[PDB]
C-alpha cells in the first residue's frame, strides 16, 4: 500500500485518498447551511463561542464574492479563505473581460476547476473545505455546493460540517412541504431554525448565529448581512421552535 | 505546483540493468506482432489489425503510418505511446530537415531523430521511456531501400527482414529460410502473408490485416502534374481488396 | 511531494564511490570488446559487434566506430544511443574550435570536452549517468598519433594500446604481452584482431561480427587518412592474417 | 590612437605605434604604449575609440593567456587572428559594439615564418606584408609599395620602417609624438628604445 | 507518524501534523498577555533570557503608529511576518493615505500563513501573534496562529502557562473592558493578568515587557525602569 | 513499490496508475450509449439522482463542447468538467488558428495525446474518466469517437461505457449481424432516440421514467440535448406501441 | 509626443544660525500663466527635527518627499529608533536621487 | 531545474556527503608537499596497475594554475578538473581587474570557496578532492603551501600529504621536519619529498612524480632518470 | 527521507538542531564585554605540528567598530562574513555613519533561516560579533543558525561552552578593566583546551572605541599568558 500517502494517487478502487481524508476535515468543522429561495439564497453558519473573551459580532465567517454571491464554508477555516481569494479574482477577471458580472454557474465551475488542480499533482495538497454558495444572475437565483474532490452541483438546499445530516433531514421537509416555493424572510427564519436543530450535535459550547442573503426583491439582488431587528427576530422564531 | 521532477526516473540497477528500458522492452513483447521485408525493388512492413470491440471502427485506427512520402512506419507495444511518436517523428523530418535543405530526410537520419527523441525519455528528469519498438522502411536516392527496427532505448539497427512483439521469435526463423537477396517486391509481399498468417488467430483477411510498401513513386497519388521532378511518393497503404486477391494465390 | 521517487543519483556512498557511475561501469562490461592499438605509422581500431542476425544489414550498418572529424574517430563500449548523444555534442566541438581558430582541434581538447561533460552528469542535475566508455583515436601536429579512452565518471587517460567492453582483463593482459613499442599498423591490425579472436564470446571469429578502422599517414606525403573498412575488406584482412 | 603600422621582412613582422594621447586641444600624454603581448611571440596594436581599444586589447590578451595556461602550449598567429576576428565579428551586430582596431604580429614557431594580419573593427581580416589602419595607410601603402621587397632583414625593414613615419610626421595635420617600435621574431618580442 | 513529513500530507482523519507541530512551537515560547478597553489597548509580555549573563529576548514589535504585536514561538519567523504588516500598513498609507485596519491586518496575516500549509517544500511558520491596534472603529485585540486562523478578542493569551491568564481575564472581563480614559489602569490589569502564569519566578525590571496603543496614545513599547512602576 | 504510484513501467511492462484510472470511470456508476442514424448521432446516458436536496437540472455529464460536437462522460464530475472545459478550448482555439470547425475525430485524437503525456509524464496523473465524442462530420458523416485514460482512441459504428457496457454491447452487436448493416436505417432522429432507449432497457433491464435518462443528440450543424418532457414524449411513443 | 515633466514655479530658501535653522518656501503653485493654487505648502516637517522641500516639477517634488518621510520611518524600524542626523539625512537622499539618474526627479532639493 | 539537498545535517551534527567526499580523497593516490627555505616541491604517486600507458599525453598530477603557482590533489580526476579550470579562469581575471598575479593565500581562499559553496547549494554534490597549492607570491621569495579539502576548509602548511597512505606519510614528516631548520636546498627538499612518498609508494621507477617550484615563475618537472638517481642514493644510504 | 524545512513533533526544526550540534564539535571561542572594551578570543586546534597555527583564522574584522570569532564549520562562515563586511559598508555609503552593532547582527542573522527547497541547508557555525556604537556602547552578541541573537555581557561557544560559561557566571562584575578581561579570557580557555594553552594555539582580539578592531600579536598574548600565570601562583 501507501497508496494514500501522496495526492494524486490512485488507489486499486480508483480513489484518491488524500482527497477523502481531506473530506474528513470537512466534516470536523461547525454547521453551515444554504437554502435556496423564491428569488435568491440565504445562507447561515455556526460560530463556537469558545470563551466569553471573543467579541461578539466580530468574527465574521461569511464571505462575499463581487457584489452578488455570498460564500460560506466549513472545515480548515483558512483553506476556504485561500478559496474565496481565488474566487474574486476569477470574479474581477471575467467582469473585466466581459463587462456582466459573473453568473453564479460561471462562477461555480471556476471554483471547481481550481479545487480540481488540486487534486492533479503531489507538491500541493487538497482543500479542507466543502463551500456553500450562491446568488442571484440574470437567469434567476442559484445554490451551489463544492466539495474537496471539485465535485460540486446545484441545490434546492445544502448543508455541510459536523451537524449536516440533522440539516440535510430539516432541508427536505421544506422541499416537500413549500413545492411552490420558499419566500426570502421566511428563508432566513428557517435558516436559523435549522443551525439550532444543527446545533444539538455541537453542543458543548454555545455559539453566536450568523445569517446573510441574496433577493431580488429583498436585497435587490445584491448580497447583506443579515443584522439587528431581523437578526433578532429569526433568533426568536429558531428559540421558539427548539422548546 | 510545477513539475519537481526534475530527475531520472531511469537509473542504473547494481547489476548494470536500466530497469525501465528493460520492462518497456515487456511491454513490447505482450505487443501485436509487426513486420519488415527487404526486396530488390521495395520494402514491405506489415501487422494485425487487433480490434478492441466489433463495433469499433478498425480503419479510423491506423498502425500503419506514412512519415514522409518515401518513409512509412509500423509498431510493437503500446497504441498511444505509437501515435504521438508518429506526431513528432512527422515534424523533425520538417524542423531538421525539409525546412533547411529542401528535400525529405534519409530513412537512416529520420530513424536516427526518432532514436534520439526516445533515448531523451530514458534519461530526461520525470519520464518514463516509450513502451513501443519501431520498425520503419523507406527509400532515398543515394541509400535505396532501407529497413529499420528503433527500440525503447533509443538503439537502431538495419534489417534485411525482421519481425517485433509477440510471435517474433518464430516469424524471425520463418524469414531466415524465405529471405534471399534476390526477391522481387511481389515475392516479398508474399512471404510476409504467410508470415503473418502464423502469428494472427481469428479472421484472416484485408480487414483485419495492415500492409504497406515502399516501393515504385506513383504519380497517380501525387495530386498534381507539371513538375518533371516530382514523380510521387514510393510509400502506398494496400487497401482491402488488393490483399485478398493475393490471399487467393496463397 | 516528489522527493518520494528520487533516486539521487548524483551522490556519494559511505565508501566514497558513485553508485551509479559504478553501476554504469557494470553495464559496459557486457558490451561487445573495442581494441585501440597505436603503431608508430598509425592507429588501429577494431571492434566487435553484439550477437549478430543473419538478416541483418551489415553494409550499410555503425554501431561501435563513428568518425569525429577527419582526424578523429571513436569505438564506442555501452548504450548507442546515449553515445550518439555526446558523438554530436563532440562533433559539433570540434567545428567549433576550427571555427573560432582556423585549426583543427586538438585531439586530448575534444577528449577533455567530451569528459567534462560526463563529470557533470556526476555532481550535479540529477539525471543518470551516460552508459558509455569510449576509445579515442587521432592525430594532430602537437602529439601526433593518439590513444585515449574515457568513462561515464568522466575520467579519461591516454595509451599505447586498450580495450573497453567485454573481457578488458584478458584482453589487456595479451596485448600487455605482445606488444612493442617499434610496431608498425600492419603488426598492428593483427594483434588487434588475434586479441578479438581469442577473447570473443563467439564460437569464431567473422567478418560480420566486426568493425574495423585504421588511421594512418599513408596517403600521399604528410597527411592522414581514415579508413573504414568495408564488409568484404574485413573479409579479406581476416584471410590475409590466417583467422579465417 | 591613430597610427599603428606593421611590416613583415624576411625573419620578423615588425610594429610601430603612435605615442600620442589627445583629448579637446589637449596632449595628454605622449609616451603612451598601444599594444600588448598576447603570447611570447605574438603581439597586438590597436587603436580606435576611447576605452574600447584598451579594454578588448586586454580581455583579448587574458583570452590567450588562458588558453596559454589551460593547454600549455602556444596558439599560432593564424590561430589567435582568426579568434580576433570573430569577437570583433560579433561585436559589430551587438547593441554597442567595439570601435576597435588591430594589427597582430607573430612568429609561427611550427613555420618558422613571421606573419602579420590585419583586422578591422568590422572583423574583415587579410594577411599583409605590411598594413596600416585609418589615415596612415594613405601615404605608407604607395611607400611601400615602391621600397619594399620581400627578402629584406630586419635592420632593412627598420630604415623601410624610419621612410614611413619621416613621410607622416612631414604631411600629417596631427602631431603623434613619434612612435614605439617593436620587433617579433624566433627569440620573442622586444623593444627598440631609440627610434 | 507516516503523514507528518510534509505539510502538503493529510492524515486519516483529516488533520495537518506539520501545522499542528508548528502550533508546539508556540506552547514551549514565553508567556504575552493581551487585553484591550474602548479606549486602549494594551499588550504584557514575559521575556525570557538564555542565562545570567544574557539579555532578555524581546518579544513585542511595531508595526506601525498605531498597530504592534507580541511573538511566542520562533522569533525570527516573527521578524518575518512583522517585516509584512509593516510593508501591509505601509502600502496602505502612500497608496490610499489611509491606517490599515486591524481587521485587514489579521486577513493578510491569515492568508500568507495558509499559503505555507498547501504546497510542497515549504514549512508552516512556528510562531504566534497577538497583534493590537487603534483605528477607525476603535481599540482591536487579535490573535494569530501559524495554521492561518486570526481571532478577534476583548483579551487573551499565548506561550507556556498562558490558560492562567486566559482564566483570569475571562473572569475579569466586565472590569477591564470598561477602563477607560486610564492608562496605568489598563496596564496594572494585565500586569495582574499575567501573574497568573508565573512559576517560581517573578516580575522584575528588566523581564517585563509593555505595550499600549489607544485614542491619544501611539503604539509605544515600555522596558527597564520605565516598568518599575507597574511592580 | 512506488512504480505502482506513479506512471513508470512496472516489471511485466504495465501502468498500475492507468489500470487504477479506468477503475474509477466506473464509480458513478452510470451506463452510456452511442449510437449512429443516417442523418443522426444519438448518445443516451444514465441519470441518478439520489439526494432530494439536488437541482437536478444542474446533474449532468453531457457536455456541449461546441456548436457541432457533443461529449459524454464515465467518470468522476471534477475530471469529467476539467476533461470538458480543456475540449471546449482546443475546440474553439482549432477553429481560430484553421479557419474550419474541429472535427470529431481530431478533437478526440487531441484529447487522447493529452491523455498519453499523463501516462508518460510523472507529476501529472491520468483523469479517471472515459470521453466518447460525437457530431454529424461534414466530411465523415455521423461519427462516434472514445477516449480512455490510456491515451487509446479509435472511431465507432456504435458503442456503449459503463458498469454494464459489456451487456450493451452484444445487444447492439447482435442487432447489427442482424440488419447487416453499420447504423440504424432511420430517417428522424427521434426514431433513433427511441431506437436507443429501447435497447438500452433490453439490454440492461430496467424501465425507465423521463428523469431516468439523459439524451444528446447530434445533426448537421448542431448538437443538443433534450428536456425531460422532449424524453417523456419519445417514452410515450416506445410504450404505444 | 508626451512631455512626462512639467514646471510649477515657486521658490525656496535655506539659513543656518548658531542653534538653529529656518527653510522657507513661498506658497503658489502655476502651470504656465495660470496660478493652480494661492496656498499649496511645499515645505515639509519629515520627523526628527528634519524639515524638507523639493522645488520644481512638483510631482515629483511630491514623490521624492514621499520617499524621504518613509526613509525615516524605516530607518526607525531598522535601527532601533535611532534618530537620523541631518548629515545621513543628506547622504540618503543623494541615493535615492542618482536612483533616477536616467530619468531624473525634476526638482532642487534643500533641508 | 534540480534542487534536491544532497548535503544535510544528521542527528550528531555530520554533513554525511561532505564526509564521503573525504573519503573518496583516500581512495586517491598520494600526494605531497614540502617547502624548504627557498622553494616548494610537489611529489605524487601513480598506482603501477596500469601498463602500456601513454606518459606523454595522460594528464599530469600536477597542474598549472598560473606561471607562478601549482595544484595537485588527491581524489576524483574528473572533479579536479573542475577546480583547476575555475582556478585558472579566476588567475587571469585577477591579472586582469588587480593588475597583479594572484597570491597563493588568494588563490587558495578562492578554490575553498568554491568547494565550500558545493556543501550547501541544492542538486550539486561536494567535490570528492582535496588539493595542495604551492608557489610565491609576486616579487617574494618566502615559500607558500596550502591545502583544501571538500568541506572548504583551507590551512597553510610547512610539509603536508593527502590521499591513500597520508597518515603513513604524514608520520614521516612530522619526525624528519625541522621547523627551525627546513630543507636548506633544492636537493635536500626534494630527496626529503622522494624519501616520504618511499615509505609508501612500492618501486621508484615509473610511480613517482616530482614538481619543484622556485620563485618568479621558475617551475620544472623532473624526469625518470632524475628521479630514479635520488631513488637509488637513498636505498644504498639505508643499507647500514 | 524528509523535508529539509520539516517541524519536529516538539516545535523544533530538526536542520536547526542538528547544525547546533556541529557547532558543540568546534573549537572553543570567548568574549567578554566591558565599559572599557570588548575581548575576544579563541581556540586555534591545529590538527598536526606541521600545520602552520598563524594561518588559522577564527578571529576576524567585520568593520573598524565591529569585529568577529567563530565555531564550528568554520568554512560556512566566510560567506557570513562576506555578508557582513558587505553590509557594514553598504550602510556607511548609504548613511555617512557607523552601522550599529545590534542592525549588523541582525543583518547576518536574516542569511541563516534562508534555506530549504536559498541555500540547501543552514549554517554549521555559531559566531561572536563584538563592537561599539554612540547609542549602546560595547556590546557583544551570539549569533546562532536558527536566526536568533542574544546579547551578552560575557559568552562561550563551542566543544567547553558550558563549563566556560559557567566560569564566566561568576568571574564576570560590571567593573571589569580590559585587562582584568584579556587575563579572564586566557584563564578560562586554558581551562577548557585539550592541549597546553600558548601564543601558538591561542589568540586574543579586542575592540575599544578609540582604536577600533585589533587582533593581538603572538608576542603581547604571550606576555599576558606570563602574567597570568604568575598571578595564580601569587596566593
Ligand atoms: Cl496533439
Same mark, same amino acid.
Given at each position: ?9 490512485? /488507489? ?15 466534516? @470536523?468543522?461547525?454547521? /453551515? ?40 464554508? /466549513? ?9 474565496? @481569494? ?35 499533482? @503531489? ?42 445530516? /440533522? ?52 436585497? @435587490? ?23 | %505546483? ?54 469499433? %471502427? ?28 508518429? +506526431? ?29 527523441? %526516445? ?20 527509400? +532515398? ?45 511481389? +515475392? ?63 | ?244 | ?195 | &507518524? ?80 512583522? &517585516? ?148 | ?241 | ?34 496660478? =493652480? ?42 535601527? =532601533? ?10 547622504? =540618503? ?19 | ?240 | ?235
Amino acid at each position: 500500500t501507501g497508496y494514500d500517502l501522496s495526492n494524486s494517487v490512485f /488507489s486499486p478502487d480508483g480513489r484518491n485518498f488524500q482527497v477523502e481524508y481531506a473530506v474528513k476535515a470537512v466534516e @470536523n468543522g461547525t454547521t /453551515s447551511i444554504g437554502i435556496k429561495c423564491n428569488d435568491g439564497v440565504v445562507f447561515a453558519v455556526e460560530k463556537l463561542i469558545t470563551s466569553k473573551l471573543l467579541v461578539p459580532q466580530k468574527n465574521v465567517k461569511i464571505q462575499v464574492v463581487d457584489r452578488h454571491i455570498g460564500c460560506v464554508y /466549513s472545515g480548515l477555516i483558512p483553506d476556504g479563505r485561500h478559496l474565496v @481569494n481565488r474566487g474574486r479574482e476569477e470574479a474581477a477577471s471575467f467582469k473585466k473581460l466581459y463587462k456582466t458580472p459573473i453568473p453564479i454557474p460561471a462562477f461555480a465551475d471556476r471554483l471547481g476547476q481550481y479545487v480540481q488542480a488540486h487534486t492533479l499533482y @503531489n507538491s500541493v495538497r487538497p482543500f479542507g473545505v466543502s463551500t456553500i454558495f450562491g446568488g442571484v444572475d440574470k437567469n434567476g437565483a442559484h445554490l451551489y455546493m463544492l466539495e474537496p474532490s471539485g465535485s460540486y452541483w446545484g441545490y434546492k438546499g445544502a448543508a455541510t460540517g459536523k451537524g449536516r445530516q /440533522s440539516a440535510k433531514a430539516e432541508l427536505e421537509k421544506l422541499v416537500d412541504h413549500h413545492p411552490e416555493g420558499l419566500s426570502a424572510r421566511e428563508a432566513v427564519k428557517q435558516a436559523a431554525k435549522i443551525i439550532y436543530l444543527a446545533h444539538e450535535d455541537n453542543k458543548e459550547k454555545d455559539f453566536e448565529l450568523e445569517i446573510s442573503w441574496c433577493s431580488l426583491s429583498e436585497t @435587490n439582488g445584491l448580497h447583506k448581512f443579515v443584522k439587528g431587528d431581523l437578526l433578532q427576530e429569526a433568533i426568536d422564531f429558531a428559540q421558539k421552535e427548539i422548546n | %505546483m510545477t513539475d519537481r521532477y526534475s530527475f531520472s526516473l531511469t537509473t542504473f540497477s547494481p547489476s548494470g540493468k536500466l530497469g525501465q528500458i528493460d520492462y518497456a522492452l515487456t511491454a513490447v513483447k505482450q505487443g501485436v506482432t509487426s513486420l519488415g521485408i527487404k526486396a530488390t525493388n521495395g520494402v514491405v512492413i506489415a501487422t494485425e489489425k487487433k480490434s478492441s470491440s466489433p463495433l469499433a %471502427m478498425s480503419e479510423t485506427l491506423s498502425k500503419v503510418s506514412l512519415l514522409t512520402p518515401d518513409i512509412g512506419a509500423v509498431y510493437s507495444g503500446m497504441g498511444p505511446d505509437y501515435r504521438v511518436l508518429v +506526431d513528432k517523428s512527422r515534424k523533425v523530418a520538417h524542423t531538421s530537415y525539409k525546412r533547411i535543405y529542401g528535400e525529405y530526410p534519409p530513412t537512416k537520419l529520420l530513424v536516427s531523430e526518432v532514436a534520439k527523441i %526516445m533515448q531523451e525519455a530514458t534519461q530526461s528528469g520525470g519520464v518514463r521511456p516509450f513502451g513501443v519498438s519501431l520498425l520503419i522502411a523507406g527509400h +532515398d536516392e543515394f541509400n535505396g531501400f532501407s529497413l529499420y527496427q528503433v527500440d525503447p532505448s533509443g538503439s537502431y539497427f538495419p534489417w534485411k527482414a525482421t519481425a517485433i512483439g509477440k510471435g517474433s521469435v518464430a516469424a524471425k526463423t520463418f524469414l531466415e529460410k524465405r529471405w534471399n537477396d534476390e526477391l522481387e517486391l511481389e +515475392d516479398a509481399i508474399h512471404i510476409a502473408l504467410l508470415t503473418l498468417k502464423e502469428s494472427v488467430e481469428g479472421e484472416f483477411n484485408g480487414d483485419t490485416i495492415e500492409l504497406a510498401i515502399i516501393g515504385d513513386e506513383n504519380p497517380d497519388l501525387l495530386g498534381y502534374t507539371g513538375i518533371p521532378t516530382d514523380k510521387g511518393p514510393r510509400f502506398r497503404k494496400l487497401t482491402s481488396q488488393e490483399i485478398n486477391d493475393r490471399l487467393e494465390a496463397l | 511531494g516528489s522527493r518520494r521517487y528520487d533516486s539521487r543519483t548524483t551522490i556519494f556512498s559511505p565508501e566514497g564511490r558513485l553508485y551509479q557511475v559504478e553501476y554504469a561501469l557494470e553495464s559496459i562490461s557486457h558490451a561487445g570488446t573495442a581494441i585501440g592499438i597505436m603503431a608508430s605509422d598509425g592507429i588501429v581500431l577494431a571492434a566487435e559487434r553484439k550477437v549478430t542476425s543473419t538478416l541483418l544489414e551489415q553494409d550499410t550498418s555503425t554501431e561501435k566506430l563513428y568518425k569525429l572529424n577527419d582526424k578523429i574517430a571513436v569505438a564506442v563500449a555501452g548504450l548507442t544511443a546515449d553515445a550518439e548523444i555526446l558523438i554530436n555534442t563532440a562533433r559539433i566541438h570540434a567545428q567549433n574550435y576550427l571555427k573560432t581558430y582556423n585549426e583543427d582541434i586538438p585531439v586530448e581538447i575534444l577528449v577533455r570536452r567530451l569528459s567534462d561533460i560526463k563529470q557533470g552528469y556526476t555532481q550535479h542535475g540529477g539525471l543518470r549517468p551516460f552508459g558509455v566508455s569510449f576509445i579515442y583515436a587521432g592525430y594532430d601536429d602537437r602529439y601526433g598519433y593518439q590513444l585515449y579512452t574515457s568513462n561515464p565518471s568522466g575520467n579519461y587517460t591516454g595509451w599505447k594500446a586498450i580495450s573497453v567492453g567485454a573481457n578488458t582483463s584478458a584482453a589487456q593482459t595479451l596485448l600487455q604481452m605482445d606488444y612493442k613499442d617499434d610496431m608498425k599498423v600492419d603488426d598492428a591490425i593483427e594483434l588487434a584482431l588475434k586479441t578479438l579472436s581469442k577473447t570473443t564470446d563467439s564460437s569464431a571469429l567473422t567478418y560480420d561480427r566486426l568493425e574495423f578502422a585504421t588511421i594512418r599517414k599513408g596517403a600521399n606525403d604528410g597527411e592522414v587518412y581514415q579508413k573504414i573498412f568495408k564488409p568484404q575488406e574485413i573479409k579479406d584482412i581476416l584471410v590475409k592474417t590466417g583467422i579465417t | 590612437m591613430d597610427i599603428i603600422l606593421g611590416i613583415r621582412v624576411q625573419d620578423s613582422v615588425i610594429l610601430a605605434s603612435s605615442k600620442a594621447v589627445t583629448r579637446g586641444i589637449s596632449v595628454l600624454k605622449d609616451s603612451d604604449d598601444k599594444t600588448r603581448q598576447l603570447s611570447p611571440h605574438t603581439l597586438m596594436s590597436f587603436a580606435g575609440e576611447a576605452g574600447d581599444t584598451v579594454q578588448f586589447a586586454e580581455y583579448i590578451q587574458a583570452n590567450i593567456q588562458l588558453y596559454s595556461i589551460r593547454e600549455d602550449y602556444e596558439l599560432s598567429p593564424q590561430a589567435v587572428s582568426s579568434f580576433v576576428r570573430q569577437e570583433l565579428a560579433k561585436s559589430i551586430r551587438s547593441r554597442r559594439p567595439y570601435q576597435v582596431n588591430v594589427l597582430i604580429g607573430g612568429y609561427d614557431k611550427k613555420k618558422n615564418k613571421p606573419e602579420l594580419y590585419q583586422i578591422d573593427y568590422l572583423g574583415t581580416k587579410v594577411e599583409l606584408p605590411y598594413g596600416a589602419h585609418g589615415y596612415s595607410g594613405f601615404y605608407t601603402f604607395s611607400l611601400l609599395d615602391h621600397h619594399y621587397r620581400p627578402d629584406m632583414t630586419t635592420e632593412e625593414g627598420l630604415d623601410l620602417l624610419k621612410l614611413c613615419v619621416q613621410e607622416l610626421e612631414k604631411r600629417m595635420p596631427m602631431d603623434f609624438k613619434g612612435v614605439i617600435v617593436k620587433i617579433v621574431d624566433k627569440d620573442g618580442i622586444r623593444q627598440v628604445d631609440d627610434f | &507518524n507516516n503523514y507528518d513529513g510534509d505539510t502538503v500530507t493529510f492524515s486519516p482523519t483529516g488533520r495537518l501534523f506539520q501545522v499542528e507541530y508548528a502550533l508546539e512551537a508556540i506552547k514551549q515560547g514565553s508567556v504575552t498577555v493581551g487585553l484591550r478597553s474602548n479606549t486602549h489597548a494594551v499588550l504584557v509580555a514575559l521575556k525570557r533570557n538564555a542565562d545570567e549573563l544574557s539579555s532578555y529576548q524581546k518579544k513585542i514589535i511595531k508595526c506601525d503608529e498605531h498597530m504592534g504585536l507580541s511573538l511566542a514561538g520562533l522569533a525570527p519567523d516573527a521578524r518575518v511576518l512583522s &517585516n509584512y504588516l509593516r510593508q501591509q500598513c505601509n502600502y496602505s498609507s502612500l497608496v490610499f493615505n489611509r491606517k490599515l485596519a486591524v481587521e485587514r491586518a489579521g486577513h493578510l496575516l491569515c492568508d500568507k500563513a495558509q499559503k505555507n500549509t498547501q504546497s510542497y517544500g515549504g514549512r508552516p511558520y512556528g510562531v504566534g501573534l497577538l497583534i493590537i491596534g487603534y483605528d477607525k472603529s476603535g481599540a482591536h485585540l487579535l490573535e494569530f496562529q501559524p495554521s492561518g486562523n486570526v481571532t478577534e478578542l476583548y483579551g487573551t493569551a499565548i506561550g507556556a502557562r498562558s490558560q492562567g491568564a486566559k482564566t483570569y481575564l475571562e473572569r475579569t472581563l466586565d472590569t477591564f473592558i470598561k477602563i477607560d480614559g486610564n492608562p496605568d489602569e489598563l496596564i496594572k490589569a494585565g500586569v495582574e493578568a499575567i501573574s497568573q502564569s508565573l512559576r517560581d519566578e517573578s516580575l522584575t525590571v528588566d523581564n517585563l515587557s509593555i505595550a499600549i496603543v489607544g485614542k491619544d496614545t501611539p503604539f509605544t513599547i515600555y522596558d527597564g525602569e520605565a516598568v518599575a512602576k507597574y511592580i | 513499490g512506488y512504480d505502482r504510484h506513479i506512471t513508470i513501467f512496472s516489471p511485466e511492462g504495465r501502468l498500475y496508475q492507468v489500470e487504477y484510472a479506468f477503475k474509477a470511470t466506473n464509480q458513478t456508476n452510470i451506463n452510456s450509449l452511442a449510437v449512429r442514424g443516417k442523418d443522426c448521432t444519438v448518445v443516451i446516458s444514465q441519470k441518478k439522482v439520489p439526494d432530494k436536496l439536488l437541482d437536478p437540472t444542474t446533474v449532468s455529464y453531457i457536455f456541449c463542447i461546441s456548436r457541432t460536437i457533443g461529449m459524454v462522460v464515465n467518470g468522476p464530475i471534477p475530471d469529467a468538467r476539467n476533461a470538458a472545459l480543456r475540449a471546449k478550448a482546443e475546440a474553439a482555439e482549432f477553429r481560430y488558428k484553421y479557419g474550419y470547425d474541429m472535427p470529431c475525430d481530431v478533437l478526440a485524437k487531441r484529447m487522447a495525446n493529452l491523455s498519453q503525456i499523463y501516462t508518460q509524464r510523472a507529476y501529472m496523473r491520468p483523469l479517471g474518466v472515459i470521453l466518447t465524442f460525437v457530431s454529424v462530420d461534414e466530411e465523415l458523416g455521423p461519427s462516434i469517437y472514445k477516449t480512455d485514460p490510456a491515451g487509446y482512441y479509435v472511431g465507432y459504428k456504435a458503442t456503449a461505457t459503463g458498469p454494464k457496457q459489456q451487456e450493451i454491447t452484444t445487444n447492439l452487436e447482435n442487432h447489427f449481424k442482424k440488419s447487416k448493416i453499420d447504423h440504424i436505417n432511420e430517417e428522424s432522429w427521434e426514431k433513433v432516440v427511441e431506437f436507443a432507449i429501447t435497447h438500452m432497457i433490453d439490454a440492461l433491464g430496467t424501465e425507465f421514467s423521463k428523469n431516468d435518462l439523459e439524451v444528446g443528440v447530434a445533426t448537421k450543424d448542431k448538437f443538443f440535448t433534450l428536456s425531460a418532457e422532449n424524453i417523456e414524449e419519445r417514452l410515450v411513443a416506445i410504450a404505444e406501441q | 509626443q508626451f512631455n512626462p515633466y512639467g514646471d510649477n514655479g515657486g521658490t525656496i530658501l535655506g539659513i543656518a544660525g548658531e542653534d538653529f535653522a529656518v527653510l522657507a518656501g513661498d506658497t503658489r503653485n502655476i502651470t504656465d500663466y495660470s496660478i =493652480n493654487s494661492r496656498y499649496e505648502p511645499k515645505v515639509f516637517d519629515c520627523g526628527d527635527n528634519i524639515v524638507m522641500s523639493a522645488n520644481g516639477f512638483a510631482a515629483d517634488g511630491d514623490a521624492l518627499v514621499k520617499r524621504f518621510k518613509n526613509s525615516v520611518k524605516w530607518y526607525h524600524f531598522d535601527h =532601533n529608533d535611532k534618530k537620523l542626523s541631518i548629515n545621513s539625512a543628506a547622504r =540618503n537622499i543623494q541615493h535615492l536621487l542618482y536612483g533616477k539618474r536616467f530619468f531624473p526627479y525634476y526638482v532642487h532639493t534643500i533641508i | 531545474g534540480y534542487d534536491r539537498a544532497l548535503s544535510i545535517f544528521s542527528p550528531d551534527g555530520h554533513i554525511f556527503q561532505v564526509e564521503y567526499a573525504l573519503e573518496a580523497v583516500k581512495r586517491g593516490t598520494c600526494a605531497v608537499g614540502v617547502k624548504g627555505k627557498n622553494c616548494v616541491v610537489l611529489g605524487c604517486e601513480r598506482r603501477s596497475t596500469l601498463k602500456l600507458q601513454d606518459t606523454r599525453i595522460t594528464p599530469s598530477k600536477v597542474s598549472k594554475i598560473d606561471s607562478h603557482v601549482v595544484l595537485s590533489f588527491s581524489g576524483l580526476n574528473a572533479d579536479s578538473r573542475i577546480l583547476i579550470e575555475k582556478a585558472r579562469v579566476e588567475a587571469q581575471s585577477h591579472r586582469l581587474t588587480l593588475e597583479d598575479p594572484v597570491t597563493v593565500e588568494y588563490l587558495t581562499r578562492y578554490v575553498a570557496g568554491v568547494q565550500q559553496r558545493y556543501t550547501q547549494s541544492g542538486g550539486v554534490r561536494p567535490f570528492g578532492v582535496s588539493t595542495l597549492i604551492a608557489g610565491f607570491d609576486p616579487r617574494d621569495d618566502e615559500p607558500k603551501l596550502y591545502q583544501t579539502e571538500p568541506s572548504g576548509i583551507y590551512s597553510s602548511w610547512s610539509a603536508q600529504t593527502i590521499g591513500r597512505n597520508s597518515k603513513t606519510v604524514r608520520e614521516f614528516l612530522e619526525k624528519n621536519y625541522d621547523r627551525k631548520e627546513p630543507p636548506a636546498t633544492v636537493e635536500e627538499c626534494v630527496k626529503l619529498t622522494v624519501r616520504s612518498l618511499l615509505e609508501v609508494v612500492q618501486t621508484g621507477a615509473k610511480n613517482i612524480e616530482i614538481t619543484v617550484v622556485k620563485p618568479d615563475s621558475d617551475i620544472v618537472a623532473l624526469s625518470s632518470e632524475e628521479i630514479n638517481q635520488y631513488v637509488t642514493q637513498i636505498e644504498q644510504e639505508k643499507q647500514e | 527521507d524528509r523535508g529539509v524545512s520539516t517541524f519536529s513533533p516538539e516545535g523544533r526544526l530538526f536542520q536547526v538542531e542538528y547544525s547546533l550540534e556541529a557547532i558543540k564539535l568546534g573549537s572553543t571561542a570567548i568574549g567578554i564585554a566591558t565599559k572599557e572594551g570588548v575581548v575576544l578570543g579563541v581556540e586555534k586546534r591545529a590538527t598536526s605540528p606541521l600545520l602552520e597555527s598563524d594561518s588559522i583564522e577564527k578571529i576576524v574584522e567585520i568593520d573598524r567598530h565591529i569585529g568577529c570569532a567563530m565555531s564550528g564549520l568554520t568554512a560556512d562562515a566566510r560567506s557570513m562574513i562576506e555578508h557582513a563586511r558587505t553590509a557594514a559598508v553598504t550602510h556607511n555609503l548609504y548613511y555617512d555613519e557607523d552601522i550599529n552593532v545590534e542592525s549588523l547582527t541582525q543583518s547576518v542573522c536574516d542569511l541563516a533561516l534562508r534555506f530549504g527547497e536559498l541555500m540547501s541547508r543552514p549554517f554549521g557555525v555559531a559566531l561572536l560579533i563584538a563592537g561599539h556604537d554612540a547609542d549602546d556602547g560595547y556590546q557583544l552578541f551570539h549569533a546562532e543558525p536558527s536566526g536568533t541573537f542574544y546579547r551578552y555581557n560575557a559568552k562561550a561557544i563551542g566543544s567547553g561552552s558550558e563549563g566556560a560559561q559557567a566560569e564566566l557566571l561568576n568571574e564576570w562584575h560590571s567593573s571589569l578593566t580590559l585587562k582584568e578581561a584579556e587575563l579572564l579570557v586566557l584563564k578560562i580557555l586554558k581551562q577548557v583546551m585539550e592541549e597546553k594553552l600558548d601564543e601558538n594555539n591561542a589568540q586574543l582580539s579586542c575592540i575599544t572605541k578609540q582604536d577600533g578592531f585589533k587582533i593581538y600579536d603572538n608576542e603581547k598574548t604571550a606576555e599576558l599568558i606570563k602574567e597570568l600565570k604568575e598571578k595564580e601562583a601569587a596566593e
